[PDB]
C-alpha cells in the first residue's frame, strides 16, 4: 500500500528483489571508494602535503602504512593506484550481482532455496545470519592484525625521528588496559576510546574484537533468543533497520569526535594538526619567537597576571599560556619531548628546541582547521588567497551531519515498528478509539 | 585602471637598474606566492613573526637590501634575519633547504623571479593594505 | 448594465489568474518592482553611491548582488526618472540609485494591490476576509523598515539595500548602532515568529499523528475526501495525549487556529513599533543603573556591559567604509581593539 | 478545442521571456576576465 | 564531597536501573491494540 | 499483580494527570535538579570566571543584574571540556567561582530534554497514536544540544557554549557571527526560511481556517462556541478554503488534502531547523560561512568592495574586542 | 475543475509547442548573449568595465556628493577615465 516515495518498502518481503537492492548498493560504496582513489591520485602531488590537497582517502591508507616512509613523504604511489583500481574493479562484480538479483533472478529466495531464504519474524534464521556476518567482521579486524604484525606494519606519528612505518611486535592484551578505555570518562583529560595514543593497544584491541565477533558470531548461529529478549524487542525486518540506525548513528558521533581529537590513527602528517594541536603551536611558535629575541618567558605576567607564555592548569601541570589553555590534554610528538613530570618543562624550553619542532609548530598554526565553505583558509574575517580546508574539518562535518540524519531515521523506523506491530500506524481505529474508553483525566 | 607596464616596472638590483615584468609574469609569480608562501604571508604580512612584513619600505631596510628582484632572489636561496647577521634556511622556506621544505623542490630560476616581482609590484596595486593587516582589509 | 460593468464582468472572470480591479494596481507594480530588483542585480552597479560593485555584471554572485540605497546625498528624494536629480537620463538614474526608489515605492502599491486582492477575492467566493487582515504583518514590517526607518534618518541612504549580503549587513548595523537586541519590541517579534514557527510544527505533527484509518494503504495520504463532512483526525486524542505531555492542550479548533493567525502576526506588528522608534535613534540602548554601577566599579561586568563593547568595535571598524560620504578617516591608533587581535 | 492567446498566456510569456534573455546574458558573464 | 559523589552514585544507578527494567517488562505489550 | 507489576502498572499508567512512563522516571529528576539550580543561582549566584584569566562576569540578580543582563555563566576555559562535578571542586565556594552550576544545569537539562523526546514517543505508543511526533521535537531538542554541547566540544571549552540568560544569548550570537560567518552559511539561511516560513504558513494556515469557519453563532458570541470539542463534523468549509486560496495565487498552488497540507506544515520549519542545527554543529568544526572577501577586484588589481566585504568589517570590529583580555597572541584559533 | 485553458502538460508535450519554442527560446538567449559580450550593458546601465572603476593613479571612489549637481558630478568623474 506504498507510494512511489516510499517504494522501497516495497521490498520488505521480496527477499530476492532486496537482497539485489543491497549488492547493487554494495558496488556503489566499492565503486566510489575506487573511483575517489583514482581521482586523489589524479590530483595528488607529492611536493605538498596530503592536507592541502582534499584528500580523505589516499590518508587513510597511506595510515595502513603504504606508500609512505619515515617523515610520512609518499615514496611509492603505486599502492594508491592498487587500491583504487581493485575496488573499482570489485564494484562491477557487487553491480553485476545486485542488478541481475533485482530485476531478472527470484523475487523471494525462500522457495527457491531454505538456506538463503529467511522470514523476518524466523528469530533463529536471523540470529543465524547475524552470526555470518559476526565472523566477517571479526576476520576483518584481524585483517588489521595481520597488516601490523606480519606484512609491514603501519605508520607511526609517534615512532623516534619523525614518525615511521613500523611493525607491531607486542600488541596489548592485557584487559586491564585494553576495556580500561571503554571506562574511560568521555570528558576531558579522558577522552573515551578516543584517547588510543599508540598502535600497540589499537592492534591488540583489534585483536580482541576479532575474537569476540567471532566468539559471538558462533554463539548466534548455535542459539536462538532468550524469552527476556524476545518479549523487549519487536520482530520485524523494519524494526532490525531501525535498531542498525540508532548504531550507524552512535558510531558516527564516535567517528566525528575521533577525527577531531585523535592524531594517532589519524596521523596530523596526513589529516593535517587537531584544532587543539594548532591552537598548541601558536603559542608554542611565540614562545620561540620572543625566547630567541631574549625574553623570559617563565617569569613574563600577561595583561591578566596569568603568565603570558606559561601558566598552570587547574591540576598544576605548566601548560601554554592564553586562550588556549583549554587545549593543554593536547599530547603531540612534536610537543612531548618538552614535557617533564610536572608539564612543560622550563629548562628544556629555554635549552632544548629544534628547528624541526619550530617548522612544525609554525606548519601547524599556519593550517589550523578553520576555512570557509569555500575553502578560503583561515578566520572567518580573512581575505581570499589560501585555498585550504582541513580534512578534519571536512572528515567531522559531514559525519556529523550523517549520524545526525541516522539518528532521526532510528526514531522514525522504530517508532513505526512499534506502531505497525502494534497495528496502528495507519492510524486511530474510528470505531475503537482508545481514549474514548479510557477514564477522563478531570 | 589597469596592468600598466609602469606598475610592472620594478628595481633589478641596487645599482637602480630596472626590469619590467609582463602580466603573464606578474599572474604566474601571483599563483607561486599563493602556492609556496601565502600560507604565513597572506597579504604582505607574516603570520609567525607579525614584526616583519612584504612591504616594499620594510624590506628597504633589511640588510641584504630585498627592494629589489636580486636581493629577493637570493632570499629564497639563502634567507638571513633582517639584520643579515644569521641564515635562516633551517626555519625558512628556500631552495637552500627545499629538502626540509619540499614546495620549494620545483621552484626554477624564473619562478623566482616571478615570486619576486609579485611582492614588489602588488604594494604598488594595494598600497596599504599590501602589508597592513586587518585594519586594511 | 453600461461600460462600467461590463469591465466588472470581465475583470471577475474565473480564469486561471484571477485578474479583478485590484489586478489593476497589483499586476503592474508587482512586476515592475520584481523585475526592477532582477534588472539592477544583474547589471546595475552601486559605484557611485556607496563605492560597492553589486551585480552579476561586475563579479557579484547570489549573495553579493543588491540593488542598494541612493547616495546619502539625494536626502529623501523621490528620484523620479524625470526629477531634477536625474533630469530623464535613464542611465543617469540608474547610477544615482533611482532603482532603489523604483522598487520600493512599486512594491508599497504592489502590497496594497495584493491586499485588495485578497478582499476582493473573498468577497466573491464568499468567504470570511482573515487572510487579507494577517497579511497587514507583513504590511506594517515592509513600510516600517523600507519607509519609515529610513525618513526619520538623514536619508534613503540607510534603509535596507534589496540583496541578501546587504541585509545582513543591515542586521549588523542595528547590533552595533541600536544595540536592537536589547530591544523588548524586536524581542516580542522574536517570540512571535520562533512562536508561528512551532505552532506550526506541533500543529502539522499533530494532525497527523493522530489520523483516523479511512483508508488501508501505509499512505495515509489517500484516505482524505476534500468533500467529507468528518474530522480527519481526533481532536479527543490529541487533547489527551498533551494534556498528560504538557499539561495543557488545545480543545477548541477555532480558537487553535485563530491562535496560530494571533501569534506571527501580532509578532511582526511588534517589531514594527520597535523599528519606528529607531527611526528617531530612539533606542533601548543602555540600562542606565549598570551604567552607573560600571563606571564607578571597574571589577563589575556583565554579558551587557561585554556586549557594549562588541557594539563599539562594530561601529568603529564598519563606519568608514560603510559611511564613505562622511569621509571617517580613523588611525589606527584610535581603533578600540583588544589585547593581540 | 482551446485558445491559443489568453490572459494565462501573457501572464506566462511576461515572466519566462525575459528570463531566458537574462539566463544568456548572465552566461555570457562567465567568460568576462578583468 | 565524597558523602555526595557516593550518594549521587546509588542515586543515578538507581534510577538507570528502574529504566533498563521498566523497559525490560514486557514494555510491548502495553499498548491498546495487540498485547504480546 | 506482585509489587513490581504495579509500580510498572502506575509508572506506564494512562489515568495519571501526567504521563510519566520509563522516561518520566530520567526525565522528571534531572528536570527537577537542572530547574532547582537554574533557579537559585540566577537569583544568588556569585560572579563566575568565564574565560579562565581571573575576570569574574556577574550573572546573578543579587549581583547587581536585571531580568534582561541576567545569566549562569559558562564554566572557566581554565576547565576547557572537563568534567566539573560539585565534589571534585575543593568547595562549593570554588565550584561558585569556576563556573560549577552551568555543567550541572547543561547536563541534567540535555539529559532531561532527550527523555522529553522519548516520553513523547513513548506516550503515543499507549494511546494507539501514530509514533513521529518526537520526531517533529528533535529539531528544538538538537538546536540545544548544538549550542551546549557539540560547540564546545568543537572549540574544546564550554566556556563557548551558550550563556543561560537573555544578552550573554546575544553575547553568543555576535561572537558566533564575527568567528564564522554564519550569515553567510547556507545552513543558517536555511533556518531562517524554516522559522520565517514557518511564521507565515502558522498565519496562513491560521488565517485560511479561519476565514472558511461555518457560521454557527451569533454576532454576540464568540465565534469559537461554535466548535464543540469532539464533534465528528469538521468546523470549516476546506473546499471554500481551497476556492479562495487557489484564486488568490492559481488552482494548483492550494492544497485540497487536508492530510498533506498538515504534513506540509509540520515538514517546513523541521527540516529548516534540522540545518540551522546542523549549521551549529558544523561551525563547531570551523567549517564557516562562504568568504568573499576581496573575490572582486578590477583590471589593475583594486579591491572593488562588495556588501560582503562590508559585512567582514563589522565581523572584525567584533573579532577585535570579543574576550578583550583572553588572547595573547595574533590569531583566535578556538 | 478548470477554466477552459489548454493544460500546460498537454501543450509542453506537443510537437508544434516545440517547434516554435526550439527557436524562441534559444533565439533569447543568444540575443541576452550578445546584450553583454558586445558591451551594450555596460553603456545602457552605466555600469563600470573592470578597468573604468578608477583612474590610474586613483584609489579614491568618485562619489556623488551633491544632489541636483549629481549627473554632472558623474559625467565629470567619467571623464576623468579619459
Ligand atoms: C545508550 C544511549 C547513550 C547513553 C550514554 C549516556 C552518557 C553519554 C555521555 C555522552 C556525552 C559525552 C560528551 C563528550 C565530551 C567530550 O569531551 O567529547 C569528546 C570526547 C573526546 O574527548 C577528548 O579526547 C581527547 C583525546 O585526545 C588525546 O589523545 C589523542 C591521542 O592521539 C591526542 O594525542 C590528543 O591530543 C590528546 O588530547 C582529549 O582527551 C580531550 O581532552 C577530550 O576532550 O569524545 C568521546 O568520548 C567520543 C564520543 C563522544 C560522542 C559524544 C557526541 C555527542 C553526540 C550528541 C548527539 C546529540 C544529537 C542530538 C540529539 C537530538
Ligand atoms: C500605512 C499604509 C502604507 C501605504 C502607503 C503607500 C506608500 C505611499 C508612498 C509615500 C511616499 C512618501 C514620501 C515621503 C518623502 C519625504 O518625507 O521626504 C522628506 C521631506 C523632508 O525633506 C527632508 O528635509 C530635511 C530637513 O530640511 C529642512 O531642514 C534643513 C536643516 O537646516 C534645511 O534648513 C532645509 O532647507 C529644510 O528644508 C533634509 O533636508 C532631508 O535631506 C530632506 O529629505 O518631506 C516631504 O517630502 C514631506 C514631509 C511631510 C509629509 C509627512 C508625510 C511623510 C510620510 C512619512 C511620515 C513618517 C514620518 C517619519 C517620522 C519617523
Ligand atoms: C540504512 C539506511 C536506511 C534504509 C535502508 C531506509 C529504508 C527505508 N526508509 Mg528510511 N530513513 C533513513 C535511513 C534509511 N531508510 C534515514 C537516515 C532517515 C532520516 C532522514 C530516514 C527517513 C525516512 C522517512 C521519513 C521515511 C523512510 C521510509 C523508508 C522506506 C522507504 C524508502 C524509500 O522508498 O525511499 C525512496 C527514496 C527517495 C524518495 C529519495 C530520497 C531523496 C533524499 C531525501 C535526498 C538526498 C540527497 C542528498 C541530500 C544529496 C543531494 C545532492 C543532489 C544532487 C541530489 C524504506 C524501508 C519511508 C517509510 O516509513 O517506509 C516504511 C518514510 O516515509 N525513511
Ligand atoms: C561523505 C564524505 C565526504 C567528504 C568528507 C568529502 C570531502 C571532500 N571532497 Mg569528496 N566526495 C564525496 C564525499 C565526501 N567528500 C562523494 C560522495 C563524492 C561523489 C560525488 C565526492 C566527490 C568529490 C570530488 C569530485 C571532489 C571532492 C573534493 C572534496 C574536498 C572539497 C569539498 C568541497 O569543497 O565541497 C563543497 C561543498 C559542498 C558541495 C556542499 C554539499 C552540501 C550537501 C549538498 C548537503 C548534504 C545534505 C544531506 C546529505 C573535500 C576534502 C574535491 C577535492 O579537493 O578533491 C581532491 C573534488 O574535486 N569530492
Ligand atoms: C541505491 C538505490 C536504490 C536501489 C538499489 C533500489 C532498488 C530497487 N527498487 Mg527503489 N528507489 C530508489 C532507490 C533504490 N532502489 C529511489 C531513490 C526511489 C525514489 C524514486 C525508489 C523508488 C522505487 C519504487 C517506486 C519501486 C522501487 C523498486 C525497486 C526494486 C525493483 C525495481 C525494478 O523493477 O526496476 C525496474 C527498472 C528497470 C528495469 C530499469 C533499468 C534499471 C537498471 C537496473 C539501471 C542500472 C544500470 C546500471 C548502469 C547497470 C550496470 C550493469 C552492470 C552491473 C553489468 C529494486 C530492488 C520497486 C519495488 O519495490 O518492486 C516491488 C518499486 O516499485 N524503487
Ligand atoms: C551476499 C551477497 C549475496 C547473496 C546472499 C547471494 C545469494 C544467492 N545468489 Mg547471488 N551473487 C552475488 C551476491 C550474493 N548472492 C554477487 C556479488 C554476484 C555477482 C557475481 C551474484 C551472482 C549470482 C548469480 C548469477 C546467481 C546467484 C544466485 C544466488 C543463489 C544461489 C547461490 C549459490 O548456491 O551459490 C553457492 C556458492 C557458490 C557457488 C560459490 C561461493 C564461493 C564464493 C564465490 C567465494 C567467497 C567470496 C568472498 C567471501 C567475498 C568476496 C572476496 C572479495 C572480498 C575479494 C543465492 C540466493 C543464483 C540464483 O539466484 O539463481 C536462481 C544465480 O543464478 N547469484
Ligand atoms: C552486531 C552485534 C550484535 C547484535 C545485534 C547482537 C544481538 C543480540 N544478542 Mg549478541 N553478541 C554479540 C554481538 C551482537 N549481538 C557478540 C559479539 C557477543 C559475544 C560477546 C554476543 C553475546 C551475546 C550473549 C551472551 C547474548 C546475546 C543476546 C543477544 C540478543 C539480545 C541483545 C540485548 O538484549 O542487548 C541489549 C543490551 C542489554 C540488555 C544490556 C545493556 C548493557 C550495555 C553494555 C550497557 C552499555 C550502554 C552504554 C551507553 C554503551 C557504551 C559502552 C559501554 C561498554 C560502557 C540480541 C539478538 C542474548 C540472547 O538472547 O542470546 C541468544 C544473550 O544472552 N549476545
Ligand atoms: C507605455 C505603456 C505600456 C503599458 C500598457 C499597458 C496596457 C496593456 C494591457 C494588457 C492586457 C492583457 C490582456 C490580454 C488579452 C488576451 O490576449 O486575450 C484576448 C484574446 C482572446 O482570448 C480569449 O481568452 C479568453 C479567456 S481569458 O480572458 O484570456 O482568460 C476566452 O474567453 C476566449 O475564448 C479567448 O479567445
Ligand atoms: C537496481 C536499481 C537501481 C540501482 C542500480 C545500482 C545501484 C547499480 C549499480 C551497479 C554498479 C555498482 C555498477 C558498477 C560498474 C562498474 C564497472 C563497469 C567498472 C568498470 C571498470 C573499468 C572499465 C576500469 C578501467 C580502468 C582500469 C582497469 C585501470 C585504470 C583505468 C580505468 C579506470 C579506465 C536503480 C537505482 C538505478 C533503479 C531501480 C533499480
Ligand atoms: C578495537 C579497539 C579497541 C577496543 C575496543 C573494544 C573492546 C570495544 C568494545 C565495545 C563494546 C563492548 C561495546 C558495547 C556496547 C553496547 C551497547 C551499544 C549497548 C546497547 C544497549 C542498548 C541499546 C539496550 C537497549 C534496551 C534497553 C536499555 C532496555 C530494554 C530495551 C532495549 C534492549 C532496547 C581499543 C579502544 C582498545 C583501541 C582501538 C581499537
Ligand atoms: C526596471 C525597469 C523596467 C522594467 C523592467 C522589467 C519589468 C524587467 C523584467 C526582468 C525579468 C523578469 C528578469 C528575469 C530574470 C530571471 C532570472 C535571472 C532567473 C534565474 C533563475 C535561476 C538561476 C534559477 C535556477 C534554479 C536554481 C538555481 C535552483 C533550483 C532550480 C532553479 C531552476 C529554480 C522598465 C522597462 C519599466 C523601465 C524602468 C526600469
Ligand atoms: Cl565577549
Ligand atoms: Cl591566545
Ligand atoms: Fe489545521
Known amino acids: 500500500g506504498f507510494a512511489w516515495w516510499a517504494g522501497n518498502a516495497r521490498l520488505i518481503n521480496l527477499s530476492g528483489k532486496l537482497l539485489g537492492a543491497h549488492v547493487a548498493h554494495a558496488g556503489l560504496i566499492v565503486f566510489w571508494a575506487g573511483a575517489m582513489t583514482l581521482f586523489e591520485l589524479a590530483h595528488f602531488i607529492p611536493e605538498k602535503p596530503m592536507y592541502e590537497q582534499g584528500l580523505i582517502l589516499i590518508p587513510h591508507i597511506a595510515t595502513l602504512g603504504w606508500g609512505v616512509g619515515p617523515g610520512g613523504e609518499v615514496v611509492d604511489t603505486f599502492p594508491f593506484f592498487v587500491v583504487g583500481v581493485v575496488h573499482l574493479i570489485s564494484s562491477a562484480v557487487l553491480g553485476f550481482g545486485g542488478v541481475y538479483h533485482a530485476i531478472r533472478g527470484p523475487e523471494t529466495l525462500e522457495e527457491y532455496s531454505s538456506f538463503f531464504g529467511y522470514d523476518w519474524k524466523d528469530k533463529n534464521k536471523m540470529t543465524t545470519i547475524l552470526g555470518f556476518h559476526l565472523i566477517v567482521l571479526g576476520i576483518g579486524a584481524l585483517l588489521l592484525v595481520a597488516k601490523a604484525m606480519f606484512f609491514g606494519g603501519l605508520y607511526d606519528t609517534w615512532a623516534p625521528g619523525g614518525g615511521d612505518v613500523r611493525v607491531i611486535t607486542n600488541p596489548t592484551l592485557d584487559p586491564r588496559v585494553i576495556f580500561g578505555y571503554l571506562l574511560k570518562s568521555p570528558f576531558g583529560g579522558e577522552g573515551w576510546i578516543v584517547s588510543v595514543n599508540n598502535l600497540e593497544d589499537v592492534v591488540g584491541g583489534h585483536i580482541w574484537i576479532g575474537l569476540i565477533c567471532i566468539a559471538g558470531g558462533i554463539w548466534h548461529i548455535l542459539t536462538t533468543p532468550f524469552g527476556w529478549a524476545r518479549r523487549a524487542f519487536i520482530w520485524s525486518g523494519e524494526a532490525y533497520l531501525s535498531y542498525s540506525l540508532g548504531a550507524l548513528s552512535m558510531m558516527g558521533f564516535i567517528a566525528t569526535c575521533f577525527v577531531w581529537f585523535n592524531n594517532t590513527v589519524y596521523p596530523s602528517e596526513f589529516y593535517g594538526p587537531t584544532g587543539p594541536e594548532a591552537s598548541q603551536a601558536q603559542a608554542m611558535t611565540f614562545l620561540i619567537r620572543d625566547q630567541k629575541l631574549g625574553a623570559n618567558v617563565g617569569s613574563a605576567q600577561g595583561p591578566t597576571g596569568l603568565g603570558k607564555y606559561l601558566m598552570r592548569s587547574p591540576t598544576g601541570e605548566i601548560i601554554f599560556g592564553g586562550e588556549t589553555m583549554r587545549f593543554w590534554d593536547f599530547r603531540g610528538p612534536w610537543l612531548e619531548p618538552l614535557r617533564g613530570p610536572n608539564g612543560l618543562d622550563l629548562n628544556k624550553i629555554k635549552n632544548d628546541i629544534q628547528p624541526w619542532q619550530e617548522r612544525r609548530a609554525a606548519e601547524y598554526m599556519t593550517h589550523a582547521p578553520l576555512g570557509s565553505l569555500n575553502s578560503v583558509g583561515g578566520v572567518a574575517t580573512e581575505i581570499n588567497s589560501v585555498n585550504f580546508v582541513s580534512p578534519r574539518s571536512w572528515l567531522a562535518t559531514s559525519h556529523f551531519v550523517l549520524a545526525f540524519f541516522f539518528l532521526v531515521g532510528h526514531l522514525w523506523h522504530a517508532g513505526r515498528a512499534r506502531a505497525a506491530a502494534a497495528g496502528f500506524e495507519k492510524g486511530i481505529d474510528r470505531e475503537s478509539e482508545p481514549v474514548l474508553s479510557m477514564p477522563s483525566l478531570d | 585602471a589597469e596592468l600598466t607596464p609602469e606598475v610592472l616596472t620594478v628595481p633589478l638590483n641596487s645599482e637602480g637598474k630596472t626590469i619590467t615584468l609582463t602580466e603573464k609574469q606578474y599572474l604566474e609569480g601571483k599563483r607561486l606566492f599563493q602556492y609556496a608562501c601565502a600560507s604565513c604571508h597572506v597579504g604582505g604580512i607574516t603570520k609567525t613573526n607579525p614584526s616583519l612584513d612584504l612591504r616594499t619600505e620594510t624590506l628597504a631596510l633589511a640588510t641584504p637590501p630585498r627592494d629589489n628582484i636580486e636581493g629577493l632572489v637570493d632570499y629564497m636561496k639563502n634567507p638571513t634575519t633582517y639584520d643579515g647577521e644569521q641564515e635562516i634556511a633551517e626555519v625558512h622556506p628556500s631552495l637552500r633547504s627545499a629538502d626540509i621544505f619540499p614546495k620549494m623542490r620545483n621552484l626554477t630560476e624564473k619562478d623566482l623571479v616571478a615570486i619576486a616581482g609579485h611582492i614588489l609590484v602588488e604594494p604598488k596595486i594595494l598600497g596599504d593594505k599590501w602589508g597592513g593587516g586587518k585594519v586594511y582589509y | 448594465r453600461g461600460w462600467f460593468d461590463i469591465l466588472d464582468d470581465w475583470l471577475k472572470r474565473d480564469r486561471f489568474v484571477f485578474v479583478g480591479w485590484s489586478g489593476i494596481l497589483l499586476f503592474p507594480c508587482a512586476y515592475l518592482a520584481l523585475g526592477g530588483w532582477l534588472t539592477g542585480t544583474t547589471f546595475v552597479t552601486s559605484w557611485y553611491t556607496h563605492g560597492l560593485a553589486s551585480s552579476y555584471l561586475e563579479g557579484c554572485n547570489f549573495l553579493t548582488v543588491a540593488v542598494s540605497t541612493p547616495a546619502n546625498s539625494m536626502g529623501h528624494s523621490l528620484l523620479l526618472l524625470w526629477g531634477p536629480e536625474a533630469q530623464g537620463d535613464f542611465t543617469r538614474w540608474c547610477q544615482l540609485g533611482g532603482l532603489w526608489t523604483f522598487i520600493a515605492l512599486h512594491g508599497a502599491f504592489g502590497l496594497i494591490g495584493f491586499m485588495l486582492r485578497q478582499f476582493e477575492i473573498a468577497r466573491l467566493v464568499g468567504v470570511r476576509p482573515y487572510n487579507a487582515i494577517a497579511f497587514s504583518a507583513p504590511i506594517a514590517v515592509f513600510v516600517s523598515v523600507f519607509l519609515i526607518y529610513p525618513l526619520g534618518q538623514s536619508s534613503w541612504f540607510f534603509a535596507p539595500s534589496f540583496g541578501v549580503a546587504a541585509i545582513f549587513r543591515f542586521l549588523l548595523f542595528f547590533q552595533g548602532f541600536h544595540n536592537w537586541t536589547l530591544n523588548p519590541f524586536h524581542m516580542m517579534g522574536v517570540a512571535g515568529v520562533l512562536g508561528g514557527a512551532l505552532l506550526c510544527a506541533i500543529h502539522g505533527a499533530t494532525v497527523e499523528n493522530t489520523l483516523f484509518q479511512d483508508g488501508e494503504g501505509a499512505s495515509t495520504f489517500r484516505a482524505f475526501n476534500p468533500t467529507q463532512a468528518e474530522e480527519t483526525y481526533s481532536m479527543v486524542t490529541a487533547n489527551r495525549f498533551w494534556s498528560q505531555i504538557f499539561g495543557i492542550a488545545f480543545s477548541n479548533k477555532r480558537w487553535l487556529h485563530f491562535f496560530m493567525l494571533f501569534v506571527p502576526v501580532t509578532g511582526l506588528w511588534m517589531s514594527a513599533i520597535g523599528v519606528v522608534g529607531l527611526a528617531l535613534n530612539l533606542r533601548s540602548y543602555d540600562f542606565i543603573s549598570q551604567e552607573i554601577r560600571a563606571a564607578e566599579d571597574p571589577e563589575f561586568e556583565t554579558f551587557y556591559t561585554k556586549n557594549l563593547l562588541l557594539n563599539e568595535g562594530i561601529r568603529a571598524w564598519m563606519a568608514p567604509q560603510d559611511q564613505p560620504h562622511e569621509n571617517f578617516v580613523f588611525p589606527e591608533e584610535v581603533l578600540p581593539r583588544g589585547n593581540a587581535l | 478545442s482551446y485558445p491559443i492567446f489568453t490572459v494565462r498566456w501573457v501572464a506566462v510569456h511576461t515572466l519566462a521571456v525575459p528570463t531566458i534573455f537574462f539566463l544568456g546574458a548572465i552566461a555570457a558573464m562567465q567568460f568576462i576576465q578583468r | 564531597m565524597e558523602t555526595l559523589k557516593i550518594t549521587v552514585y546509588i542515586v543515578v544507578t538507581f534510577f538507570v536501573l528502574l529504566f533498563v527494567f521498566g523497559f525490560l517488562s514486557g514494555d510491548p505489550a502495553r499498548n491498546p491494540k495487540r498485547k504480546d | 499483580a506482585n509489587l513490581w507489576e504495579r509500580f510498572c502498572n502506575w509508572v506506564t499508567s494512562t489515568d495519571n494527570r501526567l504521563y510519566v512512563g520509563w522516561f518520566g522516571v530520567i526525565m522528571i529528576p534531572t528536570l527537577l535538579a537542572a530547574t532547582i539550580c537554574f533557579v537559585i543561582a540566577f537569583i544568588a549566584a556569585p560572579p563566575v570566571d568565564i574565560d579562565g584569566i581571573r575576570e569574574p562576569v556577574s550573572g546573578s540578580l543579587l549581583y547587581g543584574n536585571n531580568i534582561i543582563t541576567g545569566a549562569v555563566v559558562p564554566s572557566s576555559n581554565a576547565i576547557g571540556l572537563h568534567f566539573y562535578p560539585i565534589w571534585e571542586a575543593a568547595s562549593l565556594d570554588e565550584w561558585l567561582y569556576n563556573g560549577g552550576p552551568y555543567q550541572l544545569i547543561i547536563f541534567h537539562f540535555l539529559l532531561g530534554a532527550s527523555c522529553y523526546m522519548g516520553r513523547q514517543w513513548e506516550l503515543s505508543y499507549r494511546l494507539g497514536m501514530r509514533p513521529w511526533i518526537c520526531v517533529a521535537y528533535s529539531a528544538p531538542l538538537a538546536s540545544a544540544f548544538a549550542v551546549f554541547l557539540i560547540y564546545p566540544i568543537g572549540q574544546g571549552s564550554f566556556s563557548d557554549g551558550m550563556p543561560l540568560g537573555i544578552s550573554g544569548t546575544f553575547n553568543f550570537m555576535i561572537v558566533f557571527q564575527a568567528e564564522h560567518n554564519i550569515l553567510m552559511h547556507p545552513f543558517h539561511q536555511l533556518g531562517v526560511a524554516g522559522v520565517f516560513g514557518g511564521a507565515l504558513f502558522c498565519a496562513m494556515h491560521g488565517s485560511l481556517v479561519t476565514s472558511s469557519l461555518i457560521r454557527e453563532t451569533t454576532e454576540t458570541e464568540s465565534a469559537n462556541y461554535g466548535y464543540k470539542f469532539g464533534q465528528e463534523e469538521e468546523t470549516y468549509n476546506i473546499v471554500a478554503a481551497h476556492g479562495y486560496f487557489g484564486r488568490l495565487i492559481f488552482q494548483y498552488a492550494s492544497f485540497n488534502n487536508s492530510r498533506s497540507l498538515h504534513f506540509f506544515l509540520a515538514a517546513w520549519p523541521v527540516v529548516g531547523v534540522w540545518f540551522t542545527a546542523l549549521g551549529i554543529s558544523t561551525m563547531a568544526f570551523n567549517l564557516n560561512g562562504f568568504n568573499f572577501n576581496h573575490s572582486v577586484i578590477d583590471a589593475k588589481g583594486n579591491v572593488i568592495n562588495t556588501w560582503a566585504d562590508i559585512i567582514n568589517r563589522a565581523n572584525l570590529g567584533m573579532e577585535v574586542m570579543h574576550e578583550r583580555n583572553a588572547h595573547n597572541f595574533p590569531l583566535d584559533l578556538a | ?82
Do not use: N
Open chain 7, 1 to 82: 475543475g478548470t477554466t477552459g485553458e489548454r493544460p500546460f502538460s498537454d501543450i509542453i508535450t506537443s510537437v508544434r509547442y516545440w517547434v516554435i519554442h526550439s527557436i524562441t527560446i534559444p533565439a533569447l538567449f543568444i540575443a541576452g548573449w550578445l546584450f553583454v559580450s558586445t558591451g551594450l550593458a555596460y553603456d545602457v546601465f552605466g555600469t563600470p568595465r573592470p578597468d573604468s572603476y578608477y583612474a590610474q593613479e586613483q584609489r579614491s571612489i568618485p562619489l556623488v556628493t551633491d544632489r541636483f549637481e549629481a549627473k554632472q558630478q558623474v559625467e565629470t568623474f567619467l571623464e576623468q577615465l579619459k
